[PDB]
Amino acid sequence: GSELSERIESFVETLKRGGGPRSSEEMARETLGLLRQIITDHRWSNAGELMELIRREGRRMTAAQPSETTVGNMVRRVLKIIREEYGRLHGHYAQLQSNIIEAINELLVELEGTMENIAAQALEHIHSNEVIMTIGFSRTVEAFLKEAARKRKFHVIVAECAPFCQGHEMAVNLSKAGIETTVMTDAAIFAVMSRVNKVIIGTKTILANGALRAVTGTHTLALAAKHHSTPLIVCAPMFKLSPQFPNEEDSFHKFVAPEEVLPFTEGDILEKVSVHCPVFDYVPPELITLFISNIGGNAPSYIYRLMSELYHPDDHVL
Amino acid sequence: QVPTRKDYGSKVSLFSHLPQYSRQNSLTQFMSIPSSVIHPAMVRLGLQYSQGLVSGSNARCIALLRALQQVIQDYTTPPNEELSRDLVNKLKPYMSFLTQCRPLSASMHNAIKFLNKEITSVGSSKREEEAKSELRAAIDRYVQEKIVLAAQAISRFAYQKISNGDVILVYGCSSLVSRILQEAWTEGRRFRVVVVDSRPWLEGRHTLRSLVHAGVPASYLLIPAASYVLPEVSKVLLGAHALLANGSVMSRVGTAQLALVARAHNVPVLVCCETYKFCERVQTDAFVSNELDDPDDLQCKRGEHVALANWQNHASLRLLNLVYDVTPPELVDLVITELGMIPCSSVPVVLRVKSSD
Amino acid sequence: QVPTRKDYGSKVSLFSHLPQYSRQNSLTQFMSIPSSVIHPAMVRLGLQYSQGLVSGSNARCIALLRALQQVIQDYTTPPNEELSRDLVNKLKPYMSFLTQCRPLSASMHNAIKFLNKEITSVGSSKREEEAKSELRAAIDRYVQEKIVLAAQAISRFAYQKISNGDVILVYGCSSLVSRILQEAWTEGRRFRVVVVDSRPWLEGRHTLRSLVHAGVPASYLLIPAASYVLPEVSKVLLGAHALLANGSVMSRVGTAQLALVARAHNVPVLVCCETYKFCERVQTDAFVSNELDDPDDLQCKRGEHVALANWQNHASLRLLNLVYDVTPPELVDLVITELGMIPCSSVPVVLRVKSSD
């Protein structure tokens, strides 16, 4: 009641203001905690009433941060789980609730071992004396690299995503493990791409076409990799996979303040300039070769089957 | 004597043959204060090259020719020796000192070649001060025509291409493209410019100030936002630093990347280069001949958590900031010279017809 | 116990993680003549794998299932132990010995997976010889349908594609594509076949003999002449050894090369693969998982001047002969399975609908 609405309002304002928490896996765990806390302390007669309640509570989290699709498609996965439980019990008050409890607990068991399974199958994609190029900062790709370097000796080009230099942290965290890393800017991507053998990047949101949004400037890396014919490896979990089509809804990119691009101390020329800072970008699925999830490697021509196995077509509007 | 500067940091394994210095230390720590081995204008030129005060490709050539005028004006003739041999033998350690300060642009290479060809063809019957006046007048005529008349010709040839209502994308800092944009705005074209910049030089602020002071509506963004705005961009202007024998475009490091993304968005790119900046030298990558900037320049202050502060303590960490790259000649459409609109395949043609053939 | 074979020669720096053995030495030099640790049919299978006597992708699976029938027939049950656990724990060193002899094809991997799934699902109330008869009958039904019925279905589905008067290009040695060509020639199609072969295996001679004995007009040539004849070639048949999750084609090493040159000459390529040879495993290059053949096989006698005879005395010399590569899935058009004509993107679809889903 009071604590429920208080924590819901706190989560909504946390998604409205900034990125809280920092890890997307931690935000997914808090999303499952919010959904189990909202189903354990409420009352319903029909399962469709709970479906409408979860939809009404998810619309606010979607309108809080539209660029954060993880809470929205996790709400949609929990909606499909509750729909499948109502379907297997339809062909109902405490038994359905206990089934929802054990299913969301099983979803946390599956979600805690996602990066572990990605690091487990990391060995079948990296050979010795290999030139790797990445962009931005992501825990999945650096875990991939620090597990692949346990038995193999290779090189990683840590290209920074530079609206704000976050890839320096990835370069330092890899060089502490000894991956023989090299730091450059966004302007040397195609200049170094003639020596890059594979492209291993992360993403923010996998779309329904197999398209993906990620840290900005990676569409340029995908174009240079398609020019030099190198395969792209997308180490991405199964909760960044969303049924939002690219041109269907607006607010695709996330815009931040232009201070990180052009500072406030520039002068009188700030009045007559328009400085936009997209921290994301669009990558079409034909520029992608392989997706790496915790269940195995999948093609961009196979994301629709995971969409059918994880999502329901009457929930794509939410 | 002039020693060699120590290489700074841990070099890239692909760039071990190219030197990588630092702007913190200077070579003139162990040199005399009255400059005797190196000319004082030449060591002044090396100081304003090494500290980064002269960064434009045309400004280096202009300051080079002014320092060469100061050297030839302060030249004397020894007994039983010719000027046409002694000046050749004396200007080579000067250019070696300038090379050890900062690697030379191809404009400066062709300036050295043209000046060596002119001082080689000085007759023996000519006097000292008469040949000094001939060489100073030749340098003055050379910089006069092959800077400002070529700049006005390229400005007119790009003014007759830019139409009304279009949008123009630029990259880096170049006086020729900025002069084209200013003389296009003053003569009646109504357009706005999207300025693309890159780290760590951030030299797009110069042409941003130059376009705001000229009254042009401007837009400022970086390399990753260029992919966001090129579906709206219809025209890309670029500033070339050297053009090769195969038609490659040596420019700032974000040039071939931007041209590939513009061709992916069907946006034609336009480089603007004067004919003295050409090359009979040719390369196909950014690895066999390139300039290496400071490895301490990539660090920045995003909050209070500078990660690349103590980068030398990490043995497996490498820092690299490339200056030049090349374009494949099938990516660049225009080559705008003072002779007219030529493609990329016409660069050795213009080399032939301007090399007295 | 079974030791490990010593790696032969100097490995490639990209292939240091993959083993490279030699056919000159055997692992059974330090083993008992009555085979006790390894089953005698299994060590017979390892000898006919390591010496190169069984080279076809389907022949290895057939001989594997025959050796597994000989193992299950020669199986006994200890007291207070289950067959469904003890047979699982005993067949793993057998497959480890077979892996140390020669790296396994993905058909054999899926055969091991299917047999482990079948012997896992044996009930505890079943007797010894009754479960032995069930497992032998299951292996017989498996090899029966998923060799010959899938082969006849792929042969009919490729017979309904090949028309009259066309030319067909093949590569390597594969019984499925050769059976397609024979049953297409016998049922009324009039065509000729261009056979492409490659060094050092030279396995195109087998399908060349198989096409001459079937009455088909044949043409024999190598990899460099394929670029000469593909402007005349209208159809390319290929023999796949494994199909991956992204739609890649694991086959002999000259497959993706030939497919790229055929797409450059607008010639559609056709791979022919049965559905048990698929993979949930995926790779994008020929470097992370591949078979390494003999480094002493690349040498040949062109006159009396064999240059690679003493190749080990040269420290800077490396010898490499790759067995498998992958194709990008945008280069291969057909995937002809027993369920019908599918593209390359339908391989995990067929994996799903044949994996009880």
Curated annotation (Swiss-Prot), chain A:
Gene Ontology CC: cytoplasm; cytosol; eukaryotic translation initiation factor 2B complex
InterPro entries recorded: eIF2B_beta_subunit, IF-2B-related, IF_2B-like_C, NagB/RpiA_transferase-like
Compartments it resides in: Cytoplasm, Cytosol
GO biological process: central nervous system development; cytoplasmic translational initiation; myelination; oligodendrocyte development; ovarian follicle development; regulation of translational initiation; response to glucose; response to heat
Pfam families for the chain: IF-2B (PF01008)
GO MF annotation terms: ATP binding; GTP binding; guanyl-nucleotide exchange factor activity; translation initiation factor activity
Modes of activity regulation: Activated by the chemical integrated stress response (ISR) inhibitor ISRIB which stimulates guanine nucleotide exchange factor activity for both phosphorylated and unphosphorylated eIF2.
Keyword Cytoplasm: yes
Role: Acts as a component of the translation initiation factor 2B (eIF2B) complex, which catalyzes the exchange of GDP for GTP on eukaryotic initiation factor 2 (eIF2) gamma subunit. Its guanine nucleotide exchange factor activity is repressed when bound to eIF2 complex phosphorylated on the alpha subunit, thereby limiting the amount of methionyl-initiator methionine tRNA available to the ribosome and consequently global translation is repressed.
Subunit structure: Component of the translation initiation factor 2B (eIF2B) complex which is a heterodecamer of two sets of five different subunits: alpha, beta, gamma, delta and epsilon. Subunits alpha, beta and delta comprise a regulatory subcomplex and subunits epsilon and gamma comprise a catalytic subcomplex. Within the complex, the hexameric regulatory complex resides at the center, with the two heterodimeric catalytic subcomplexes bound on opposite sides.
Disease the record associates with this protein: Leukoencephalopathy with vanishing white matter 2: An autosomal recessive brain disease characterized by neurological features including progressive cerebellar ataxia, spasticity, and cognitive deficits. Brain imaging shows abnormal white matter that vanishes over time and is replaced by cerebrospinal fluid. Disease severity ranges from fatal infantile forms to adult forms without neurological deterioration. The disease is progressive with, in most individuals, additional episodes of rapid deterioration following febrile infections or minor head trauma.
Family: Belongs to the eIF-2B alpha/beta/delta subunits family.
Protein known as: Translation initiation factor eIF2B subunit beta
Species this chain originates from: Homo sapiens
Curated annotation (Swiss-Prot), chains B, C:
Outcome, altering Y324H: In VWM4; with ovarian failure
Domain of life from the UniProt record: Eukaryota
Localization: Cytoplasm, Cytosol
GO annotation (BP), single: myelination
Family: Belongs to the eIF-2B alpha/beta/delta subunits family.
Task of the protein: Acts as a component of the translation initiation factor 2B (eIF2B) complex, which catalyzes the exchange of GDP for GTP on eukaryotic initiation factor 2 (eIF2) gamma subunit. Its guanine nucleotide exchange factor activity is repressed when bound to eIF2 complex phosphorylated on the alpha subunit, thereby limiting the amount of methionyl-initiator methionine tRNA available to the ribosome and consequently global translation is repressed.
Descriptive protein name: Translation initiation factor eIF2B subunit delta
Gene: EIF2B4
